[model samples]
Every structure is written in structure tokens, then in C-alpha cells.
Target: GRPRAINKHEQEQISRLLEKGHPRQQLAIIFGIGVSTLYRYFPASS
Candidate 1:
């Protein structure tokens, strides 16, 4: 199956989850994506 393209709203949601302390692994599972993908979306470290 083809994966749907990530959208602005989805990116915002991901960013929010990351800010809320959701680990990349859990975010990947929840978003039906890979950890690397999440990392690519959010690469900056504070």
C-alpha cells in the first residue's frame, strides 16, 4: 500500500506530541511511520 504524504496539520500534530514528551518510537507507532522518519521531521535537539 502507498503511504499518504505528510501534511502541515500532521506535522504540527507531530511537533506537538514531541513537545509533550512523546518519544520518537511511540510517535512512530502512533503515526504508522518509522522512527527515522520522525527524526527527519524533527532533527533539532534542545
Candidate 2:
């Protein structure tokens, strides 16, 4: 199966936001992506 191409810039943006104390819900809303999608980028148990 072909994987979706993740945007590095977006990922970095999200990572930065997370590091700045933005919650997953806020990150998802700001990024226009779902909460699950955000979790996919940052796993809970990782």
C-alpha cells in the first residue's frame, strides 16, 4: 500500500507547537487535522 506523504514542514510546525505546550486538541484544530491524526504523528506511549 502506498503511504501518505507527510509534510516535513507541517510536522515540524506541529512538533514545535507541542513543545510549546499546545494540547493535542488545540494542535488538531490549528492544523485542520483530526485528533487521531495528531496522535499518529505523536504516539501516547512513545
Candidate 3:
């Protein structure tokens, strides 16, 4: 089964972090996922 490693709160956190100029790849590493997976969740930002 796929792991639900991120929560709703964490998703929001990622959104804010992105607004604050954090790089997607770096954020993905901090969140234990790949940049592609991060984009899968927040696909409308850019």
C-alpha cells in the first residue's frame, strides 16, 4: 500500500514554505519525498 506520509497540515505548511521562497526540491527532501511527488500534491502553484 502507499504510505500517507504527509498530512493536511503539512500540505499547508508546504504551501506557505513555497511562498516564502523555499525550493521545491529542497522542501521535498525535508518532507521525505521527491520533487515530483511534491508537485503531485500542489500542482496549481505555478
Candidate 4:
């Protein structure tokens, strides 16, 4: 199957979750995406 793409709403929700202290791994599961895919949208925060 071709790679899946996330919509703007998903990105927004993910960003909010990240700010809410949700781990990247958790988000991957929540969004049905790989950790790497999440990283591609948002790099590790300093």
C-alpha cells in the first residue's frame, strides 16, 4: 500500500496531544501512524 498522509486536523490534534505530554509512541498508536511519521511532522522538542 502507498504511504498514508495525515490531514491538517490530525496534525493539529497531534500537536495538542504532544503539548499535553502524550508520548510519541502513544501518539503513533493513537493516530495509526509510525513514530517516524510523527517525527517527520514534528521533530524532537528541545
Candidate 5:
């Protein structure tokens, strides 16, 4: 199961944190979500 959406704030938060490490791997460590699902919300670069 998954949440409906990530929303703008979450995306921004994740984006900022991305600078520290790998996109997919970081997302999991920081946000507790799989990279596959996080990809749908926003690109780590964008």
C-alpha cells in the first residue's frame, strides 16, 4: 500500500536532503520509503 501523494513540502524536504547521498538509498534511510515509490512523487535532481 501507498499514500495518496507526497505534496510539495515533502518533495522539497527530500530534494534538499538528496544533496547528501544517493537518491533512492537516501530516501529510504531518511523518509522510510522505497525508491520505486518515491520516484513517483519527485525526481531527486528536480
Candidate 6:
């Protein structure tokens, strides 16, 4: 398979975690991306 340009299945997992009240800062480290990147996924607008 080709390398994925986008993170796979991460949306669903992140959604669940956020829904369960997992803090964005903690999740950013767990997801191996910076907190800003996590915010990009779950924007301030949201």
C-alpha cells in the first residue's frame, strides 16, 4: 500500500477520546503530534 498522506482512523479515536474528556494536551503526546496539531484536528471553532 502507498504511504498515507493523512492520519488513518485517528479521527475516530481522537473523537472518542475528546468525547470521553481526554485533555487535548495529553492526547497530543499520546498521538505523537504537537498540541497545536491536535488543536488543528479539534479546532477552537469546534
lDDT, candidate 2, 1-46, per-residue tens: 8654348887887777777877989877766778988889878653
Q: After superposition, how far is residue 14 of candidate 5 from its true place, in Å?
A: 0.4
> Candidate 1 local accuracy as lDDT?
0.80
What are the per-model C-alpha RMSD values against the true structure? 2.8, 2.5, 1.7, 2.4, 3.3, 3.4
The total number of steric clashes, by the backbone 3 Å criterion, in model 5 comes to 0
Descending-TM-score candidate ranking: 4, 1, 3, 2, 6, 5
| Candidate 2: segments with Cα more than 4 A from true spot | 1-6
lDDT of each: 0.80, 0.76, 0.82, 0.82, 0.65, 0.75
**Shift of residue 17 alpha carbon in model 2, Å:** 0.7
Writing each residue's lDDT as its tens digit, candidate 3 over 1-46 gives 9877678898888889988988888998777888888888877555
lDDT of 5 by residue, 1-46 (tens): 7654566887777766664564666677677777777766656445
Clashing residue pair totals per candidate (backbone < 3 A): 0, 0, 0, 0, 0, 0
Ranked by lDDT from best down, the candidates are 4, 3, 1, 2, 6, 5
Q: Highest lDDT: which candidate?
A: 4
lDDT of 4 by residue, 1-46 (tens): 7856788987888888888888989888876888998988888861
Q: Which pairs of residues collide in candidate 1?
A: none
Alpha carbon deviation, residue 22, candidate 5 (Å)? 4.1
Model 1, range 10-41, lDDT digits (tens) per residue? 89988988898889898888778888878888
Q: Candidate 3 versus the native: TM-score?
A: 0.74
The candidate, 5 or 6, that scores higher on lDDT is 6
Best by TM-score: 4
Q: For model 5, what is the error of residue 34's alpha carbon versus the real structure, in angstroms, after optimal superposition?
A: 1.8
